Amino acid sequence: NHSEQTLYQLMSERLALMPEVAKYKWHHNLPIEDLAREAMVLERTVSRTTVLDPIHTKTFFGLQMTAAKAIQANVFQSLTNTDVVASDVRSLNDDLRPKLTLLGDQIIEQLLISYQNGTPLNRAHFDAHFAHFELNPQIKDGLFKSLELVLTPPRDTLARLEKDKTLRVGVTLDYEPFSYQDNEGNRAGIDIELATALAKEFGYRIVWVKTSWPTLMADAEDNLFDIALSGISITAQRQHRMMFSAPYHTGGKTAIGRCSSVDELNTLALIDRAETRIIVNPGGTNERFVRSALTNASIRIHPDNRTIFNELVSGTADAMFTDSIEAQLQATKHPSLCVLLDQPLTFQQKGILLQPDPELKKRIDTWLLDYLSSHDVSALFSKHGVDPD
Ligand SMILES: [Cl-]
């Protein structure tokens, strides 16, 4: 209630000063971007948010910075042939930036307060609050989802692993390119290789445990696995009772359907009509998206994520919302299929699902962050069919 609004008010007061920032920079022929300042503000923030997850915190303040630079670039458009004068500008260093610094610190204070009091968040309130800002949907989505994860606050799994050296890894094997079976029928994909490298680092052997999108969290709650990987989206709902690793992929949801359909389905407004038959796989973020985002289209839940795309080819449904990486893979695999939208509508990251053991999470992240620094995922991604655009 109270904290949520205050949080939104402070975030909006910052963005509202950004036209003034852009005018000063336009006057002094400065660029929007200033990496010095960005770095420094992000260290200041990290050091001041110790009790909060530092990945979620950096993503949240990171997307505020993106939003702010997008507003600046909109102003830049409007300034091209103007005569800005001293009289028209406000001081960047004595006026605006002090104000922005104060607001940032007040946002941190509200974060910590909300984090300790279990302030609940409402997407409708957020939407209403930021509706007038001139911001692409993914960035708006990102701000809300990241704020949700920041504000989300125990097993002895690592202790057991250290004794038995046997890592039980949950996989769905129904999401190419993350986890699937190859034409010999062996487990394959990004997440098979990542889990193999994690096990190797810790000197564990892997036991593979089959799970599903409908039974993921019950399986996790019953401790049927230690970790799980299969392109699993990081969500505040899934961090109710489990934990995640650092993210290893960033994207979000788009739509796929037939190329012969594109000119009638190339916008969310065109997709969400009662004519349109939506198909979706049960029990994960695809389902939770289409149930929340659509008001008109009909919604069929198809049992098997492996054969769902054939329904679009066959003409028994018209569109599916899924992750951008999956849509682009399936649009390459199927001549008749096309990505329908120009860009994704949501912000979402993939991570390793973990039993809630702090010490497990700590070790896994240390490994993962280092691993990502050193290879490109890009190449692992590309080996399982993912065009590195
Ligand atoms: Cl994606």
Residue numbers in the entry: 24 to 176, 181 to 416
What does the literature reporting this entry say, word for word?
Chorismate mutase (CM) and cyclohexadienyl dehydratase (CDT) catalyze two subsequent reactions in the intracellular biosynthesis of l-phenylalanine (Phe). Here, we report the discovery of novel and extremely rare bifunctional fusion enzymes, consisting of fused CM and CDT domains, which are exported from the cytoplasm. In γ-proteobacterial fusion enzymes, the CM domain is N-terminal to the CDT domain, whereas the order is inverted in β-Proteobacteria. The fusion enzymes of Aequoribacter fuscus, Janthinobacterium sp. HH01, and Duganella sacchari were crystallized and their structures refined to 1.6, 1.7, and 2.4 Å resolution, respectively.
To investigate the relative locations of the active sites within a single polypeptide, ∗AfCMCDT, ∗JbCDTCM, and ∗DsCDTCM were crystallized, and their structures solved and refined to 1.6, 1.7, and 2.4 Å resolution, respectively, and Rfree/Rwork values of 24.8/20.5%, 24.3/19.9%, and 25.8/23.0%. Like ∗MtCM, the CM domains of ∗AfCMCDT, ∗JbCDTCM, and ∗DsCDTCM form six-helix bundles with a single active site in the N-terminal moiety. In ∗AfCMCDT, representing the ∗CMCDT topology, the presumed substrate access to the CDT domain faces away from the expected product exit site of the CM domain, with a distance of 35 Å between active sites. A full structural assessment of the domain interface in ∗AfCMCDT is precluded by the poorly resolved linker region. In fact, there is ambiguous electron density for residues Pro177-Asp180. This may suggest a more flexible connection of the CM and CDT domains for ∗AfCMCDT than for the topological counterparts ∗JbCDTCM and ∗DsCDTCM, for which the linker regions are clearly resolved. Still, residues Asp164 and Lys168 from H6 of the CM domain of ∗AfCMCDT interface extensively with the CDT domain. There is no indication of dimer formation of ∗AfCMCDT; however, we noted a right-hand shoulder of the main peak, which could be due to conformational isomers, e.g., due to partial unfolding. The coupled CM+CDT reactions showed that equimolar concentrations of the active-site KO variants ∗AfCMCDT and ∗AfCMCDT complemented each other perfectly and reached a catalytic activity (kcat = 2.8 ± 0.2 s−1, Km = 9.2 ± 1.5 μM, kcat/Km = 3.0 ± 0.7 × 105 M−1 s−1) that coincides, within experimental error, with that of wild-type ∗AfCMCDT. This result directly suggests that the enzyme fusion does not provide a catalytic benefit.
